[PDB]
Tab-separated table of C-alpha atoms and ligand atoms in Angstrom:
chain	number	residue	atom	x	y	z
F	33	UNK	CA	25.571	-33.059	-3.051
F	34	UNK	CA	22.328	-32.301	-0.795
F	35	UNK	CA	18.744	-32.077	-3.307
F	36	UNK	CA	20.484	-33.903	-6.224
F	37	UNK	CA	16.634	-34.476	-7.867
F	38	UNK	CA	16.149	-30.342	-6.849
F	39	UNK	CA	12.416	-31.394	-5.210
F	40	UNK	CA	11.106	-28.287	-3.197
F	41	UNK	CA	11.745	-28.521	0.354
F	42	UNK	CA	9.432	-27.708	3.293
F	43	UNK	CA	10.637	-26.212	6.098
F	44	UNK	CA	9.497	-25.556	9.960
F	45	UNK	CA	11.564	-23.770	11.858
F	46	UNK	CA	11.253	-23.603	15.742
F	47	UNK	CA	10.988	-20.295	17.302
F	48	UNK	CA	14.607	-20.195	17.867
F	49	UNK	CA	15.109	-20.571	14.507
F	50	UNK	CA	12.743	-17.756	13.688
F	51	UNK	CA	15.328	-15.386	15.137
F	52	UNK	CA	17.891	-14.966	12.494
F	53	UNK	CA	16.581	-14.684	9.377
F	54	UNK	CA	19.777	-14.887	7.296
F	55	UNK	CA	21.219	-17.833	9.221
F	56	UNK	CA	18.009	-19.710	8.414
F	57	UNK	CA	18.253	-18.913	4.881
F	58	UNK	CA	21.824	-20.502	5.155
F	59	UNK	CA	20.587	-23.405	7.083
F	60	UNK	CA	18.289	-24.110	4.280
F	61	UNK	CA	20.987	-23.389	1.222
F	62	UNK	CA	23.251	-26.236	3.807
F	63	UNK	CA	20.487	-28.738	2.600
F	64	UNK	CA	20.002	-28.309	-0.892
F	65	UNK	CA	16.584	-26.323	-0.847
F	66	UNK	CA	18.346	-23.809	-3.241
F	67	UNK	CA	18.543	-26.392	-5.756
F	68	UNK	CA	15.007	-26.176	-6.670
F	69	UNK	CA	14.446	-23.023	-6.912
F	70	UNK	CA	11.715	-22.247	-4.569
F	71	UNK	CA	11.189	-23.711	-0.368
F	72	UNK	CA	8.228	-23.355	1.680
F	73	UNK	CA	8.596	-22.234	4.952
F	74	UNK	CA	5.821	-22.895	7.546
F	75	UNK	CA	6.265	-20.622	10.755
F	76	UNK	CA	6.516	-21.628	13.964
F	77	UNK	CA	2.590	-22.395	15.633
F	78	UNK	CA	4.078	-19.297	18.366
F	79	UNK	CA	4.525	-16.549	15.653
F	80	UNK	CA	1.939	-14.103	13.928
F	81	UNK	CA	2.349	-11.563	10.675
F	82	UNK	CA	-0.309	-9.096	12.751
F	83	UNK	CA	-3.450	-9.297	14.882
F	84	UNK	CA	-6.112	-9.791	12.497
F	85	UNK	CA	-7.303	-9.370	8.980
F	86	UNK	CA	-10.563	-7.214	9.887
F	87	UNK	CA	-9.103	-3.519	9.317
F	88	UNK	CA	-8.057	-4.038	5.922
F	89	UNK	CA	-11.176	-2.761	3.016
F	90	UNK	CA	-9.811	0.762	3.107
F	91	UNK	CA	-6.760	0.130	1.496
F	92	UNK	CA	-7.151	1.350	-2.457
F	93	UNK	CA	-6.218	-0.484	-5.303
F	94	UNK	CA	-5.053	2.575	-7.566
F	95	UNK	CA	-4.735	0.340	-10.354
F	96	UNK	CA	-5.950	-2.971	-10.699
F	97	UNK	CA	-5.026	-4.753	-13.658
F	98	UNK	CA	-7.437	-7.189	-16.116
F	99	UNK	CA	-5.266	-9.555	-17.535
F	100	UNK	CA	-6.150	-10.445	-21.122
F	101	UNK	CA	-5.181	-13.687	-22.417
F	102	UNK	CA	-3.631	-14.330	-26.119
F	103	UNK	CA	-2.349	-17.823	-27.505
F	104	UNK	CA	-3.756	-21.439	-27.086
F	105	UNK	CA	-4.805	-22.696	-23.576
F	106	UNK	CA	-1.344	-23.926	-22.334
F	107	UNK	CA	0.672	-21.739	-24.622
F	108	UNK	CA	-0.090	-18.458	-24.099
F	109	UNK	CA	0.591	-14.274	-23.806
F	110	UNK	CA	-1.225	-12.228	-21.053
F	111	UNK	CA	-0.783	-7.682	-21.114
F	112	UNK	CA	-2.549	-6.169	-18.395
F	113	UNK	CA	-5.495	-3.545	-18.905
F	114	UNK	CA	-5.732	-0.989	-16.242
F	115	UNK	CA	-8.739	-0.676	-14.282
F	116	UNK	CA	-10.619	1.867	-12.097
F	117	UNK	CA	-9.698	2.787	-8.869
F	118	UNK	CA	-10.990	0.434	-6.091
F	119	UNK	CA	-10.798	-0.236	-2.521
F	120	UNK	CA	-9.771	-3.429	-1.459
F	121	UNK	CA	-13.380	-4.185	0.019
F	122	UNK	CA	-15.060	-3.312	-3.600
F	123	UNK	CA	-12.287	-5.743	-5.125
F	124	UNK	CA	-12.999	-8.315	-2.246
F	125	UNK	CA	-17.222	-8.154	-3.263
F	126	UNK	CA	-16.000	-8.190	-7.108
F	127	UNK	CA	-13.480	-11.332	-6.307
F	128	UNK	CA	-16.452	-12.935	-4.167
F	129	UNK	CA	-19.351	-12.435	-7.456
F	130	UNK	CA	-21.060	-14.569	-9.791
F	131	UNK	CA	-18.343	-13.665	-13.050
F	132	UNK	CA	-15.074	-13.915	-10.691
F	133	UNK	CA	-15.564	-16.494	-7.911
F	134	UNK	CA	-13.772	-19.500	-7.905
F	135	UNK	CA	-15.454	-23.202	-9.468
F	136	UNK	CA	-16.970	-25.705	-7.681
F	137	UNK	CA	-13.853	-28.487	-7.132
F	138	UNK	CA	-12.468	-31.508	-6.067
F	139	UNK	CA	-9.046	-30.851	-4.291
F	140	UNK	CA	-6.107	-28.673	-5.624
F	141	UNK	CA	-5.566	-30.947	-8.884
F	142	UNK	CA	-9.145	-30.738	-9.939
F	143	UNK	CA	-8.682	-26.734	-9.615
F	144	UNK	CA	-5.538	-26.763	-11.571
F	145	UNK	CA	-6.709	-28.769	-14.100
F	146	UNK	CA	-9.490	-26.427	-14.552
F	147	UNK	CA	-6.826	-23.461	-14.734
F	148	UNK	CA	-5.165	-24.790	-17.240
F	149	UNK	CA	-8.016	-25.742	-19.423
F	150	UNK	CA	-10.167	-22.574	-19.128
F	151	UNK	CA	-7.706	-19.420	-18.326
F	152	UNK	CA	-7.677	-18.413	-21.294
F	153	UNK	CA	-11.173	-17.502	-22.033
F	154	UNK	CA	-11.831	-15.436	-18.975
F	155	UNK	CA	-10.210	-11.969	-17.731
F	156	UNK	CA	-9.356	-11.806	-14.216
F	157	UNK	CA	-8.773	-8.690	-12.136
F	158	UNK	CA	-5.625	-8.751	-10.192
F	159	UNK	CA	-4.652	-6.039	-7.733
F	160	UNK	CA	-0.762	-6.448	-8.376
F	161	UNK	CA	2.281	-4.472	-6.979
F	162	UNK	CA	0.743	-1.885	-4.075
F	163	UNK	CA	3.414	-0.632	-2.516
F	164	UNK	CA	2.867	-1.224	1.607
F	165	UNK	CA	2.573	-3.824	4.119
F	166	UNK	CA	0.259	-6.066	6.250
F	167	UNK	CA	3.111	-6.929	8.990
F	168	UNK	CA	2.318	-5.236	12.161
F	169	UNK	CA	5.403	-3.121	13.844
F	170	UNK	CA	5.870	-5.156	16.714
F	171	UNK	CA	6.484	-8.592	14.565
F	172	UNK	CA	9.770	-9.000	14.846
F	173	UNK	CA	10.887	-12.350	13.071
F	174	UNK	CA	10.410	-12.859	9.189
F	175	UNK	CA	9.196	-9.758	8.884
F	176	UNK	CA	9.308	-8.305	5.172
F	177	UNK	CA	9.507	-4.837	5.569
F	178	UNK	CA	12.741	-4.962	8.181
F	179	UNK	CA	14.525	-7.336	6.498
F	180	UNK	CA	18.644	-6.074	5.326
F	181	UNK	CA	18.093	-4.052	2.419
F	182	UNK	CA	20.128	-5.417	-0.854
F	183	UNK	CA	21.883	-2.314	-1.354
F	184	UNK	CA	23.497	-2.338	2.461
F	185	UNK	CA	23.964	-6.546	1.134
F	186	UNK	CA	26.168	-4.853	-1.854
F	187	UNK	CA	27.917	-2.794	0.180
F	188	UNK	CA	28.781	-5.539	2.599
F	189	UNK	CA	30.171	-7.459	0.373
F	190	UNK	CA	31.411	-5.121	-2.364
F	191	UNK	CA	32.680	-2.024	-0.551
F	192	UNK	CA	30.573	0.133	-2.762
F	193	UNK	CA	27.438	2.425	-0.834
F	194	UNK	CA	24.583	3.094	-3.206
F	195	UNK	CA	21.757	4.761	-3.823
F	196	UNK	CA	18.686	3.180	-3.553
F	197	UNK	CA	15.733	1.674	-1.536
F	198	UNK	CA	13.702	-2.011	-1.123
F	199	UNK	CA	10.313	-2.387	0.186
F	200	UNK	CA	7.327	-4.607	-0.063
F	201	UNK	CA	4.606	-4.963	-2.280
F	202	UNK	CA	0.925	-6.400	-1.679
F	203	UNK	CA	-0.659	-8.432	-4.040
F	204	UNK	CA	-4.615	-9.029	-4.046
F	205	UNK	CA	-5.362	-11.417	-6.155
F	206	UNK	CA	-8.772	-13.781	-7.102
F	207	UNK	CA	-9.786	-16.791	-9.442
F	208	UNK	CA	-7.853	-17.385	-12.334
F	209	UNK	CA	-5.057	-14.191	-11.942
F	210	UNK	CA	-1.907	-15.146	-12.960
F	211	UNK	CA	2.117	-14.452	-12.517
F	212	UNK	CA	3.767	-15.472	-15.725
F	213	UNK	CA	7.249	-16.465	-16.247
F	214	UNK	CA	9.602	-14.903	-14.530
F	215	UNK	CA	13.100	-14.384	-12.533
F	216	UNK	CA	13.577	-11.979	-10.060
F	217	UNK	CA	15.287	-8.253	-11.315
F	218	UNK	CA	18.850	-9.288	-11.402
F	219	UNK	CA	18.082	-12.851	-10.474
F	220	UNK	CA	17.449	-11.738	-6.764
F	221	UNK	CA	16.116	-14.162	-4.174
F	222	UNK	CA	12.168	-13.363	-3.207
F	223	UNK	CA	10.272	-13.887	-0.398
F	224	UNK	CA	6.304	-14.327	-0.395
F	225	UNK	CA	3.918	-14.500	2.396
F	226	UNK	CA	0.415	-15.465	1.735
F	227	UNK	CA	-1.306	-13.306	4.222
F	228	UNK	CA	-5.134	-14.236	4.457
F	229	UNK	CA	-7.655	-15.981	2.056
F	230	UNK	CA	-7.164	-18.763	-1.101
F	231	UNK	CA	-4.271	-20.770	-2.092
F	232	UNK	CA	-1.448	-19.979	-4.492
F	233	UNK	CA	-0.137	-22.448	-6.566
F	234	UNK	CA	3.314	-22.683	-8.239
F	235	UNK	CA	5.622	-24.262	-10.865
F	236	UNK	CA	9.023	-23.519	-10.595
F	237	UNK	CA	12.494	-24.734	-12.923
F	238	UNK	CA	15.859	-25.408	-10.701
F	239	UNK	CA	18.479	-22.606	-11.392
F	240	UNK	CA	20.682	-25.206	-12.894
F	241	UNK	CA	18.203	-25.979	-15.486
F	242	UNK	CA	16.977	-21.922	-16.219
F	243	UNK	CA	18.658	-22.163	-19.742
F	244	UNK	CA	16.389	-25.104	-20.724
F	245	UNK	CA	13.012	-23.203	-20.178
F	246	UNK	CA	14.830	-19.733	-21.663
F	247	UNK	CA	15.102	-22.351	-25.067
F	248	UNK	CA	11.775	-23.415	-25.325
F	249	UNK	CA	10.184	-20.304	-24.766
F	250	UNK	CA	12.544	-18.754	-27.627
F	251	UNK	CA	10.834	-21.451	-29.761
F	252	UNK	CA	7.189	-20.738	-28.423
F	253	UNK	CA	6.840	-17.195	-28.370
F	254	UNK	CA	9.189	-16.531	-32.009
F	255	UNK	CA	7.924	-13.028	-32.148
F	256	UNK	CA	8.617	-11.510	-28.588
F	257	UNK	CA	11.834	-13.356	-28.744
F	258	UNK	CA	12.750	-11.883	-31.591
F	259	UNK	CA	11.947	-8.687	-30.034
F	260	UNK	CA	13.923	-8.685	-26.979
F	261	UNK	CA	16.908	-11.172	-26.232
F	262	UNK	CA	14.964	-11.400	-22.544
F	263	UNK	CA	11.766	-11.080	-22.907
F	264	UNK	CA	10.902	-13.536	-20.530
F	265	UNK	CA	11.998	-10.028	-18.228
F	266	UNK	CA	8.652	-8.380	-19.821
F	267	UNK	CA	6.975	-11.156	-17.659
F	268	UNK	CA	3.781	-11.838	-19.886
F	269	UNK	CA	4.375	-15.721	-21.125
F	270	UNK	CA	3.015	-18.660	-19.755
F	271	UNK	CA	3.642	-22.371	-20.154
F	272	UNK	CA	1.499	-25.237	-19.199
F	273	UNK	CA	2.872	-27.941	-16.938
F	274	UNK	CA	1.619	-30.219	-19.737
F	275	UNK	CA	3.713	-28.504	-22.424
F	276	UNK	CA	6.757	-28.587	-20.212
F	277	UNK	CA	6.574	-32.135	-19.309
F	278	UNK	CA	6.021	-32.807	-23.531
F	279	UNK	CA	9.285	-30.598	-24.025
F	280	UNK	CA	11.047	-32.479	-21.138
F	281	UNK	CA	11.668	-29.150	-19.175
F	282	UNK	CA	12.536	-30.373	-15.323
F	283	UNK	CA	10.125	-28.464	-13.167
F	284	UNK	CA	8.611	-28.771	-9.923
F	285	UNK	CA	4.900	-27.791	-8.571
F	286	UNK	CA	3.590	-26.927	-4.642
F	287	UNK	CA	0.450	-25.081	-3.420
F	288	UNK	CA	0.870	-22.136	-0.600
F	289	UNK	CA	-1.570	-21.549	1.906
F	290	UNK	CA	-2.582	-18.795	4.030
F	291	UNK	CA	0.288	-18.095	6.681
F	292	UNK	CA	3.358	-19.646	4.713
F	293	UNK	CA	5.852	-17.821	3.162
F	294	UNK	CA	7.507	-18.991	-0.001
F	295	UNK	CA	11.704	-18.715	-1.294
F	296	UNK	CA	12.486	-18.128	-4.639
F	297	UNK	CA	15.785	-18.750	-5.216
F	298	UNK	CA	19.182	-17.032	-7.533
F	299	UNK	CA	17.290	-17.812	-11.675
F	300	UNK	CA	14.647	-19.911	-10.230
F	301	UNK	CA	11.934	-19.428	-13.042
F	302	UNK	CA	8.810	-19.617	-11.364
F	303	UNK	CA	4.950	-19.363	-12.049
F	304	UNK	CA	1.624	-19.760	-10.510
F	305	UNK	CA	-2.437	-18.833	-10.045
F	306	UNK	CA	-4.205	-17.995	-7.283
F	307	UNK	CA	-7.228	-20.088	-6.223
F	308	UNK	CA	-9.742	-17.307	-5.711
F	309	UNK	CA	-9.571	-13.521	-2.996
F	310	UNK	CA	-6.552	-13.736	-1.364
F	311	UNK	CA	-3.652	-11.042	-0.219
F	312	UNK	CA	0.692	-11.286	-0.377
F	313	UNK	CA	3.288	-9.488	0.154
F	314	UNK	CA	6.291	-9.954	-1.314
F	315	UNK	CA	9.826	-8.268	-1.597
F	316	UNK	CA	13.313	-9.378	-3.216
F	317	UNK	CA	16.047	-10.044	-0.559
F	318	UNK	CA	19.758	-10.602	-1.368
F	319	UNK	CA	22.550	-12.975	0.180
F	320	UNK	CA	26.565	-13.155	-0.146
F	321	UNK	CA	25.934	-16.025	-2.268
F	322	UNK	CA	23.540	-13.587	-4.680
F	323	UNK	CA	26.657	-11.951	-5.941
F	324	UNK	CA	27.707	-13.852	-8.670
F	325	UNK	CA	24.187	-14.339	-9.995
F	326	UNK	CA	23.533	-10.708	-9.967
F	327	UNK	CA	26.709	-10.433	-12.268
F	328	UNK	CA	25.416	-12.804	-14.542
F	329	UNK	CA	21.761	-12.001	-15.086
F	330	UNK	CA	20.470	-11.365	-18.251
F	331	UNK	CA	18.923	-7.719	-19.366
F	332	UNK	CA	16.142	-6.474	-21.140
F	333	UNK	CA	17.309	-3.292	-22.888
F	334	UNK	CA	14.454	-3.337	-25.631
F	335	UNK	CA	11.945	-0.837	-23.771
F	336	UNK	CA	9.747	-2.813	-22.767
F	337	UNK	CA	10.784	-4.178	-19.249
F	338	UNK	CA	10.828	-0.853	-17.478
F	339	UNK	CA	11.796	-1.259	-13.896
F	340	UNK	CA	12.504	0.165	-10.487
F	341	UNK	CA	14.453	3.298	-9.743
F	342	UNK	CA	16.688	1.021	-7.253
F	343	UNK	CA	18.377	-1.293	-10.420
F	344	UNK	CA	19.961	0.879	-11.490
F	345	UNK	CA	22.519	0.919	-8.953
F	346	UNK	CA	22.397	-3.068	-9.249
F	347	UNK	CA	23.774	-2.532	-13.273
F	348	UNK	CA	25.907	-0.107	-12.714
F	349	UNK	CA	28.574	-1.390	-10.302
F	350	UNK	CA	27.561	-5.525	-10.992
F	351	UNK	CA	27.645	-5.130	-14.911
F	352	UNK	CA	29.378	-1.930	-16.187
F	353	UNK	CA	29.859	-3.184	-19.721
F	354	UNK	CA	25.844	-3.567	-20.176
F	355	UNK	CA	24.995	-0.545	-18.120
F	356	UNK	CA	24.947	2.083	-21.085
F	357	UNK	CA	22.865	-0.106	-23.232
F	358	UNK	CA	20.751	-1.304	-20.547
F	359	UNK	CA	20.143	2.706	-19.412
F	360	UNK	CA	19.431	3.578	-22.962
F	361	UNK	CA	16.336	1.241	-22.663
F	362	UNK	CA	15.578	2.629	-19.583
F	363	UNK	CA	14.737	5.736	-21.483
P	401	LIG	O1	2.007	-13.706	-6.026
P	401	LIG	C1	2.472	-13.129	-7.076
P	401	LIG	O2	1.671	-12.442	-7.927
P	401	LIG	C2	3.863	-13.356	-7.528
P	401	LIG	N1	4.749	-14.378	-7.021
P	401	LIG	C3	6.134	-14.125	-7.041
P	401	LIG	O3	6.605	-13.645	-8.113
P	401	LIG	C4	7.216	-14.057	-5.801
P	401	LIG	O4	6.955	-13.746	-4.439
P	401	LIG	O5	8.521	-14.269	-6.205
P	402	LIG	MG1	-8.208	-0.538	5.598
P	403	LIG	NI1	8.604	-13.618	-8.339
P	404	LIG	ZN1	12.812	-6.515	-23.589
């Protein structure tokens, strides 16, 4: 068996190997990277997301997001307050000020052990979920907004056409801003690129061990779990490495910089901060071998969730027993 331990691989594909996205994806899954939950791929020196970074202050943030921490420093509940309007060079200046910018540090470890010790007590401003893309039109490997959509994936495999659309998102983030934890809507694979600017660090739990993290946040967060059978969908709760590793929870940790893109796997619970300004995209991707995970995934049907249009589809034909339930949340 290929990964037994499930560490997070690193990948670096030649430009051949750039060619064919979902063979590489296989190539990787031959070696065990799956296991883990989450791979780093580092492009090949020849290939470029776009021309340069210099054009980009006039996109808008319609709705940046504070989030507001609740809980103890490694035990904690973050809900997002929404913001005025700003443009991505405003949120860059604001990022870059005296209240926002990132600490003095060491290395990586000195910054994450400031994270984890002072999150809590500060409110960060994250530009989260823009709907566009930074890859220019003329990049043709890797890039995230030609990939195979998952609804021509479901009809490949399937038989079934549906309804439905999949594009990328930007993320702008700074110091301290935070993606809790979380699996992908119906335990999809992702894909991340770090586009320009600060580091992104995350911690991530191997698919085969998803149920063990779903158990101690049950017994950390007693109220929202009460709530909501899968609340860990509302994606608001975080968990400290320090707490896992007390609670025995297998996990893994790797830092992503500027011009690597980042896997998540089929139920890889993952996690992470960003280092200070800094821009992704991201979308959710989906692979024969995503079938019988999408079958499987859990729901949130208590309201609070609320997703895409494009799930719908996903419920529907994948899990027909939950779909009335899981609508009736919907609305
Ligand atoms: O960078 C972010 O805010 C979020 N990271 C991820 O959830 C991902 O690409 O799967
Ligand atoms: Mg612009
Ligand atoms: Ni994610
Ligand atoms: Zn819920």
């Amino acid at each position: 068996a290929q990964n037994p331990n499930c560490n997070i691989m690193i990948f670096h594909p030649t430009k051949e190997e750039f060619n064919d996205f979902d063979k590489y994806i296989a190539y990787m899954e031959s070696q065990g990277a799956h296991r883990a939950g989450l791979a780093k791929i580092i492009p090949p020196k020849e290939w470029k997301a776009r021309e340069t970074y210099d054009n980009i202050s006039e996109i808008l943030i319609a709705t940046p997001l504070q989030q507001v921490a609740s809980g103890r420093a490694g035990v904690f509940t973050q809900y997002h307050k929404k913001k005025k309007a700003m443009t991505v060079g405003e949120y860059r200046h604001l990022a870059n000020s005296k209240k926002y910018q990132t600490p003095p540090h060491q290395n990586f470890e000195d910054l994450e052990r400031k994270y984890w010790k002072n999150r809590i007590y500060n409110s960060p401003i994250y530009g989260a979920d823009i709907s566009g893309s930074l890859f220019d039109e003329n990049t043709k490997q890797w890039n995230l907004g030609h990939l195979g959509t998952i609804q021509d994936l479901l009809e490949k495999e399937c038989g079934v056409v549906i309804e439905g659309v999949n594009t990328p998102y930007l993320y702008f983030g700074m110091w301290k801003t935070t993606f809790a934890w979380h699996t992908e809507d119906m335990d999809l694979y992702s894909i991340n690129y770090l586009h320009l600017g600060e580091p992104k660090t995350w911690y991530v739990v191997p698919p085969e061990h998803g149920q063990r993290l779903e158990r101690l946040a049950r017994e950390l967060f007693p109220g929202s779990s009460r709530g909501c059978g899968a609340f860990l969908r509302h994606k608001v709760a975080l968990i400290s490495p320090t707490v896992l590793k007390e609670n025995g929870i297998p996990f893994n940790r790797i830092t992503q910089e500027a011009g690597e893109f980042m896997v998540t796997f089929p139920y890889g619970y993952h996690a992470g901060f960003n280092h200070g300004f800094n821009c992704a995209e991201a979308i959710n991707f989906a692979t024969p071998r995503w079938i019988d995970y999408g079958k499987m995934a859990s729901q949130c049907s208590c309201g609070e969730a609320r997703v895409t249009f494009s799930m719908d589809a996903f419920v529907r034909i994948l899990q027909p027993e939950r779909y009335d339930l899981w609508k009736r949340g919907q609305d």
